[PDB]
Structures are given as C-alpha cells and as structure tokens.
Design a protein around this ligand. Structure first.
Ligand SMILES: Nc1ncnc2c1ncn2[C@@H]1O[C@H](COP(=O)(O)OP(=O)(O)OP(O)(O)=S)[C@@H](O)[C@H]1O
Ligand SMILES: Nc1ncnc2c1ncn2[C@@H]1O[C@H](COP(=O)(O)OP(=O)(O)OP(O)(O)=S)[C@@H](O)[C@H]1O
Ligand SMILES: [Mg+2]
Ligand SMILES: [Mg+2]
Lengths: 434, 415
C-alpha cells in the first residue's frame, strides 16, 4: 500500500550504497544508553549489508535467482513473494529493489536482466526498522527517555506474564513482546473473561511496533510493559521505552529464556552493551508453577536460589522406545499436552493420528497440568542440549507431570534421570508458603 | 565427653564407611590403653540420592535427612551449577558444615573423618576445613593425588590417597582404610591426652626488607610467620588471624592487590585486610612489590597485556610492570578497607622504590608510579583518624626502612 512509498529511500538504491565491509572498528560515544541504541541501529545496518552482499555474491557467481526476460527461475527459491531483492541490470549494475507481485510472479522492468532473492529478503523488516529508527535521530544521535525503567529479573513460572496481565491498564498502557505467538497468547489470556480488552493496539510484537511506528493506531502510552525484554538488544529496549512515550516501563526478563544472541557475523556486541541499564532491578525467584524437582534444575541455571510454592516433589520420568513406529495413538496413548522439539516430529505425530500437537517453541509461556514430550528423530537435534533454552522451556510447562518419550539417548534423558535420583528431603528445602 | 564423627555417602559406600568407623572405634580404644575419657563414635550419612540408610551396625547414626533438616539454604549455594548432582552435593556440604558447627558448640567435637571420590571429597573437604586448625580432619580420597587446593585450602585437612577407586572392601582398601583410621584415632587420642606472633607478607623482590624486619622482630622478642604473597599467602595469614594465632601484622608486600585489580594469577580476593581490621590487631601496611602483576609464561599473558612492560623471571612465570593509572586503583582498594578501621593502623611508604626491580638502575624502576601511589594513599586516608601515613626517604629494601617499619609497629603495639 502506502508502505512501499515510506521505504523509497531503499528502492533502487545501489547495492553498494548499503554494503559496509567493516563494522568492527566502530567506536561509539556518549551515554551508555545512547551507545546501545547506536549499536542497535548498526546491528540492523550490518544485518542488511550482509543480506544485500550475499544476494550480489550469488549474482556474481532459498537463494533464488530469476531470469527477467523469460520470467522463469534460473534457481527457484524456497520462499515466495519476497518483499525485496537485488536487481542486476543489463549494464550489470546492482540495485536493491522493493518487489511487487502479480499472477505471473515478480513485476519487472525492461532494463532488469536478473533478480536475486533469499530468506533474508522475504521481508523488509530491517529496512522498515532502519527507516523508523533513523527518523528519530538528529545527526545519528538518538533521544533517551526520561521515564523510569524497572527491570524484573525472573524465572519460569514466577509470574512474569501474570503480573503484566494483572497490573496493566488496557485503556492507557502498552504491552510489547517478541514474537507473534507470545503476543497472541497474551491477548487470549487477557480476553479470556469474555470481553476484548487486549487488541492489536495495546498488545503488539516488537517488530510490528518498530516497523509500523507512526502508521497510526496510537503512540502515547502511560506505562509500557515488555514481556521477556532480555530476548532483545539493549538498544532496542531503550528505543521502545522512548517511542512508547511512557512515563514508566516495566521490563520483565528472564536470563535463560533464549537471551538475545548477536547472530550477525563478526558484529561487535561487547559485554557492557549486553547489560540493560535500568533505574531499579527487582527479582523474582519463587516459581508458582513448577514442581520441586524442576525447581532443583532451575536452581542450577539461575543466579540466586529458586524456590517453589508447589507441593509436587517429583514429576518427571522418561521412556526409551525401541521402535519409533510403536509410538502411535493406539499402541500408546500420550497423556495431556503432546509436545515435540522439531516440526518434523510434530508433523509425524499428527499424521499418526495424535491430536493437538505443538513444538516446545510454539508453547513458550504456556502452562499445562500434564505433558507428554516426544523425540522421534534418532538423528542429531541441536536444540536438545543440557544448556538449551528449549530444554529449559520443555521442562517448565507442567504443574503435575512430564514424561519424555525418546528414540535415542540425549542430554534430556540424563537430566530427567538425575532429577529422579535426588533426595526428596533435599527437594523439600525449596518449598515456600506463598 | 569427646566424640568423633565418621562421615560418608552411605548410599554408595556403606560397607567402606562401616569398615572405617569400625576400625576407628577399635583403634581409639586400643591407643588410649592409658585410658581415661572414652571417645564416642557417631556415623553420619551424607547421601544425596533418595536411597535411605537407617543404621550403621551398632553405631550412633545420623541419617541423610537429619543433616539436611538442620540447615537452611544460604548464599554459598545460590550460584549456578553444572548438573543436578553437583548442586545436591553443594547443599549437603553446607548442611554438613552447619551440622558440624552445632556439634562443635554444644558437644565436644574431637575430630572428623570421612571418605569419598571426587564428589564425596568435595562434599567433605568444604565442611571439614571450616573447623578450627588443630581439630583432626581426615579424608580417604580417590583424588588426594592431583590438584588438592580446592579441598585443603589453608587448612590442616589431610587427604589419604585411596590408591584404588573406593569400591568395596578388598585386600587393598582394607589396608588403606585401616591405616587412615588408625592415623585419625592416633591424632584424636594424642590431642585428648594432652609469645606475641607477628605475620609478615613476602616476595622474592622484598626479601631483603622481610629478613631485616624478621631479624629485628626476633630480637625484640616476637615470633614471626612469613607468608609468600602468591594470593594464598595473604589469605593463609588472615585465616590464622581470625584463628587467634596472629596478634599483629606487618603487611610489607601487598602485591596481591595488584593481581586482584589487573587480573593476575596470584591475586587476593575482595575480602583482603578485612580479617585484620575486624580483629582490631595492630597493623603496619606498606606497598611492597605493588609494581608487578603476576602471569607467566609469556604466551599465557592475556592479549591486551602483551603490549605492556614484561619481565621474564623464568620459564613458568613472567612479571608485568604496573602503570601509573593502575597504582591509583591499588590505593583506592587499600584505602577503602583502611577507612573502615576501628583500631590503630600505620602505612609506611618507601619513596625510592617498592621492589628490587623498582630501584634506581633496575628493570621495573618508575619513580612516577611510586610517587603517584604515595600521593593517592595520603589523600584517601587524610581524614582517617585511626590511620597514620608515613612517607620515608628510603627504598623498601633499605635496612633503615625495615627498622622504620618495626618502630611504627612498636608505637601502635607497645611493649
Ligand atoms: N489457566 C490457568 N489456570 C490456573 N493457573 C494458571 C493458568 N495459567 C497459568 N497459571 C499459573 O500462573 C503462574 C505463572 O504463569 P506465568 O506468569 O504465565 O508464567 P511466567 O512467569 O510468565 O513464566 P513463563 O513465561 O511460562 S517461562 C503459574 O503458577 C501457572 O501455573
Ligand atoms: N542425580 C543425583 N542427584 C542427587 N544425588 C546424587 C545423584 N547422583 C548421585 N548422587 C549422590 O552423590 C553422592 C556421591 O556419589 P558418588 O558415586 O559416591 O561420587 P564419588 O564416588 O564420591 O566421587 P566420583 O565423582 O564418583 S569420582 C552419593 O550420595 C550419590 O548417591
Ligand atoms: Mg510468561
Ligand atoms: Mg542458583
């Protein structure tokens, strides 16, 4: 619509003008918050340079390439309807272009010879964010909010989302969260009493907020609530606080809930940048959900002791399955909520006839009485590691029981096995009244 | 009525624990044939699994659950851990420490002995070294041969090598366990049937000062204990201070402070000096070897320091010269502690140099740093009524500086 027009600064810009083979010798100046915000912008500039640069590299010698004249692909991409790509003209020049699509594919121009797209150009979120963030800068200098920022450092099931849902005034405040799944769950839980108080305006994903800032809706809020703010670059949090025009912001965070990872190759994100600067730090170390054994595990991953209000002591168990095929709804029904680590395993169980299956990642923040966790892939699964955020999440959803069914030995089998062996009297030491 | 405790994880080493206890009881009775006070033996289970042990032959016995129930989770175990067993052992270790602390108060603790692999040794060591020096502390360990500092620390904890992994009573363990138990009983019975000391910190580069001071002190009628300032030395001295073994300190070499600030291999912890000030014992402090941070070998030297002035003392160790900015930091740490003093303290500073390497015509010589250290110290302590700052016209190794340090000690601790 009118969004493509808002990104005109990027349309047909030379690929070279957006590429920066450096961003390692960058020296920031000013207050810590300013440096973090500057650094956040550069992480976006660096992520875009890499995306544009790889598209050009592909043209020079997922990563799809289109022949303009024949309207047929030389290399078919995995995704569809990419929002942008790099164009190679007949003079062999490289320009970034915001793409349009019709019944027959990409709408092209006569002077375009080939067009390259990739997983990174599927969406123009980086450009969208740059556009928004750069308009807030006066000569590269971002404005820092005078609002008080309170950080609530918590653990699984301590009440991060519950507190937000309990304290927010849906008519004046804003709740920002990373990921659509989380945003949808928050709205659903907020609207569960029967009335819709949580909408697309007072509950938004971080990406949507950054990308569509100004496009309308509403911009000024009295208080800002961020659920899982430690999943974001510190400079991003600084921008969100300022952009919400709030007088106070509550950043609910969790150091083990998939913390913000640089990801950008050779991009600098020093330890002093990774630490959020707030006016007050609050701590939550009592889980109101997890059993005492899962709590023992949590104590191992968090600074500070973790206590539990729950009376449940031991709740985990597992089972090694010989024949992956034996795991079917008739042979062995799976109690409660059925979860898997990968999509492939998820599809498998669904085709086998199991009802309502989701991946661990798809149920972040959710609670269940009983969980049946399943691994059908005997091949290596990277996200299943002793210190993996997915494992942490996978062990902290249930209030009553968790059973892990796997076709192969892995770090999770060890964790569950060790938890089953610990003394129950030791486990009692985590108990608190509440 | 003297009592000793035999401790171990009964869920995995029940028979060995029993055997040891049995041998300790028998040995205690034999060796004390001279008789008198009877020594009681209590067996303590520190198992952390759910497997329960309710007795150990005919011994007074404390189950795993009773050790834990006397304890409340504390700061010692609030950090992060590698696995479930590691955290369980850490909590049990502190619970054991509490149990022994109560035993040592409302009971006559005569000694403690235990056995274990790396995990059991880790569990027992921590609790055992919390007891006063002198009280027999013995552990038959499968890891007595290797790095033992994390187990023994500055204590008198004794690790008897198990020779073979601890697994059942066999011809080998019978002998090893028997000797260890007989040794413990010997220590216990021998202990039952039966001068003002100054602590001084030292380094090779400040030995001239230390020996002069030591000789002077002995002449004044004092007894001395010299500690190599390798990080552990400073702590060893301070633990002895709170232990009542040291009545005065001449902290000549505070170099451990440098490694703590910069990040060397022979660093002190953030608690340096605390023990001395809290005991309110006379303290004369100086800046010996504060011109060098320890590393070695060169290759080891953190990247950001290879551009610094290094001195290869030998193959395994290299000394880095401290800059002028780092010294001010040293002063801040020292002063920050000294400004908490509630008893007399004297700081003696040598104008000429702080080490044999920080002397006219020497590698580390830098009067710009020496001068800075002096000024920062005077200024930070200027408003401390309990502290006097003396700036003497000598090099730390001059015989007159040594004798000046002693004079200062005598005036805050007259005789
Ligand atoms: N539908 C429900 N009925 C009753 N209790 C619930 C329900 N949903 C959640 N809870 C409880 O609410 C408490 C905290 O829920 P949350 O605040 O969502 O967990 P959290 O602090 O956000 O940690 P995460 O996001 O799941 S890692 C736990 O004790 C849950 O068991
Ligand atoms: N998963 C677990 N949770 C709680 N306690 C455990 C667990 N696994 C083992 N333990 C206990 O930890 C204690 C030490 O186990 P041990 O096998 O005796 O270790 P160790 O022989 O002393 O030293 P190493 O590490 O085996 S060389 C025993 O009480 C075990 O029962
Ligand atoms: Mg939540
Ligand atoms: Mg912890």
């Amino acid at each position: 619509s009118e969004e493509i027009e808002s990104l005109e600064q990027f349309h047909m810009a030379t690929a070279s003008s957006l590429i920066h083979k450096q961003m390692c010798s960058i020296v920031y100046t000013g207050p810590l918050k300013v440096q973090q915000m500057k650094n956040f912008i550069d992480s976006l500039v660096a992520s875009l340079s890499a995306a544009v640069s790889n598209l050009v590299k592909i043209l020079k010698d997922k990563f799809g390439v289109l022949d303009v004249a024949s309207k047929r692909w030389l290399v078919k991409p995995s995704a569809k309807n990419h929002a942008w790509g790099v164009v190679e003209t007949h003079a062999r020049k490289y320009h970034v272009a915001l793409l349009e699509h019709d019944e027959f594919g990409i709408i092209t121009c006569d002077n375009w010879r080939r067009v390259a797209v990739s997983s990174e150009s599927v969406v123009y979120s980086d450009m969208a964010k740059l556009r928004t963030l750069r308009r807030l800068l006066k000569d590269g200098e971002p404005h820092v909010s005078s609002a008080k920022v309170v950080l609530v450092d918590g653990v699984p099931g301590c009440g991060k989302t519950k507190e937000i849902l309990s304290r927010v005034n849906f008519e004046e405040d804003l709740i920002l969260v990373p990921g659509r799944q989380a945003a949808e769950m928050i709205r659903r839980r907020a609207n569960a009493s029967g009335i819709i108080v949580a909408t697309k305006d007072n509950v938004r994903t971080v990406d949507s907020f950054l990308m569509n800032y100004g496009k309308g809706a509403r911009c000024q809020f009295k208080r800002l609530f961020i659920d899982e703010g430690l999943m974001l670059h510190t400079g991003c949090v600084n921008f969100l606080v300022e952009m919400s025009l709030c007088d106070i912001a509550y950043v609910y965070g969790d150091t083990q809930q998939i913390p913000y990872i640089n990801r950008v190759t050779g991009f600098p994100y020093p330890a002093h940048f990774a630490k959020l600067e707030v006016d007050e730090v609050e701590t939550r170390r009592t889980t109101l959900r997890c059993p005492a054994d899962v709590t023992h595990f949590l104590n191992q991953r968090y600074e500070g002791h973790v206590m539990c209000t729950s009376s449940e002591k031991k709740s985990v168990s597992q089972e090694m399955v010989s024949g992956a095929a034996s795991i079917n709804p008739v042979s062995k029904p799976l109690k409660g909520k059925i979860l898997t680590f990968t999509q492939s395993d998820k599809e498998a169980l669904l085709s086998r006839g199991y009802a309502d299956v989701h991946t661990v990642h798809e149920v972040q923040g959710e609670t269940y009485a009983d969980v049946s966790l399943v691994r059908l892939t005997p091949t290596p699964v990277s996200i299943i590691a002793r210190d993996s955020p997915h494992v942490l999440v996978s062990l902290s959803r249930h209030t009553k029981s968790l059973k892990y069914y796997t076709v192969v030995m892995d770090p999770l089998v060890s964790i569950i096995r060790d938890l089953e062996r610990v003394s129950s009297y030791l486990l009692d030491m985590y108990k608190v009244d509440a | 009525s003297p009592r000793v405790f035999c401790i171990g994880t009964a869920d995995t080493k029940f028979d060995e624990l029993r055997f040891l206890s049995e041998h300790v009881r028998s040995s205690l009775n034999s060796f004390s044939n001279k008789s008198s006070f009877k020594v009681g033996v209590t067996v303590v289970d520190v198992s952390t699994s759910w497997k329960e042990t309710n007795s150990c032959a005919d011994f007074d016995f404390v189950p795993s659950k009773d050790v834990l129930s006397c304890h409340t989770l504390g700061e010692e175990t609030m950090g992060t851990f590698a696995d479930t067993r590691g955290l369980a052992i850490a909590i049990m270790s502190k619970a054991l420490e509490t149990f022994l602390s109560i035993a040592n108060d409302e009971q006559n603790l005569a000694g403690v002995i235990g056995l274990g692999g790396s995990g059991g040794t880790s569990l027992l060591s921590s609790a055992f070294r919390s007891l006063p020096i002198g009280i027999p502390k013995v552990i038959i360990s499968t890891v007595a041969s290797g790095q033992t500092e994390s187990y023994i620390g500055t204590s008198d904890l004794v690790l008897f090598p198990s020779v073979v992994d601890i697994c059942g009573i066999n011809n080998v363990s019978k002998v090893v366990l028997s000797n260890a138990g007989a040794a413990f009983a010997g220590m216990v019975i021998g202990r039952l049937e039966s001068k003002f000391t100054v602590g001084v910190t030292m380094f090779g580069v400040t030995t001239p000062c230390v020996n002069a001071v030591k000789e002077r002190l002995v002449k004044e009628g004092y007894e001395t204990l010299v500690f190599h300032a390798t990080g552990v030395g400073g702590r060893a001295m301070e633990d002895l201070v709170r232990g009542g073994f040291i009545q005065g300190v001449l902290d000549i070499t505070t170099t451990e402070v440098a490694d703590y600030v910069v990040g060397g291999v022979m660093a002190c912890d953030s608690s340096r000096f605390d023990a001395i000030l809290e005991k309110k014992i006379p303290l004369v402090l100086s800046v010996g070897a504060l011109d060098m941070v320890n590393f070695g070998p060169k290759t080891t030297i953190p990247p950001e320091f290879q551009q610094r002035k290094i001195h290869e003392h030998n193959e395994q160790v290299s000394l880095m010269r401290t800059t002028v900015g780092e010294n001010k930091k040293f002063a801040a740490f020292i002063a920050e502690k000294l400004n908490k003093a509630s008893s007399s303290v004297c700081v003696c500073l040598p104008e000429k140099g702080v080490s044999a390497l920080d002397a006219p015509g020497k590698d580390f010589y830098d009067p710009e740093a020496t001068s800075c250290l002096t000024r920062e110290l005077q200024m930070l302590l200027e408003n401390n009524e309990r502290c006097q700052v003396k700036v003497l016209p000598y090099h730390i190794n001059d015989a007159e500086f040594a004798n000046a340090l002693v004079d200062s000690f005598l005036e805050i601790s007259p005789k």
